[PDB]
Amino acid sequence: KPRVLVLTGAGISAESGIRTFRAADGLWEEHRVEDVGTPEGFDRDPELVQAFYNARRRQLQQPEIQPNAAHLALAKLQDALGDRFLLVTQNCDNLHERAGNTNVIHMHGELLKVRCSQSGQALDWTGDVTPPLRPHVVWFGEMPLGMDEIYMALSMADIFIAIGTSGHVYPAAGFVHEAKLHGAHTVELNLEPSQVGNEFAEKYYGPASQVVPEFVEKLLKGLK
């Protein structure tokens, strides 16, 4: 069986009720990235930033937020491939886990974890953060998580699939190039062509809830 590496971004959770970065500004939930998504923003106004992520963490656990068909299809894909499958997500949500995927690499961290910053240790955390703990979230200027295992998988992949990601944020946006260098077949699945879509050998556009189960199903049937 082929080694398959899947990269996901915010687009795969859009239809699950988790709103995406509006590309038109530089705003996330009506906030500037510099203020809520940098270490400097956190130093400058810790209680606003803590409040921002407290809000994101709560919204994540609302009943109307659920895995969609795309999350489920990736769980089925892992079921079929075993250890020849690796899922890397830029998302801080837990929808891959709720869908049934395991060993999900959260290269940008997790909303349901916080970090004792003198510690390097991440701790499970589902409630608000009050009065110094920080969100276990990778901010701009900080090193993404799990990169060693990710780059090893990129060099070994027979198929690399990028789902729901716009190709603006590095190093994740560079994964498609790295995969191609080591001979992988590359696939982009997205609502619209990404900033790096031209690097991909194969591509399909439309809502993830439709496009991803469609691609996964035709991948699985091609196996047997």
């Binding site: 990235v33 701009f140 900080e142 990169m147 603006h168 944020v169 190093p171 900033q195």
Partner: peptide, 9 residues
């Protein structure tokens, strides 16, 4: 690799 970074500076 490198740190998390956006396509515009």
């Amino acid at each position: 690799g490198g740190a998390k970074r956006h396509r515009k500076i």
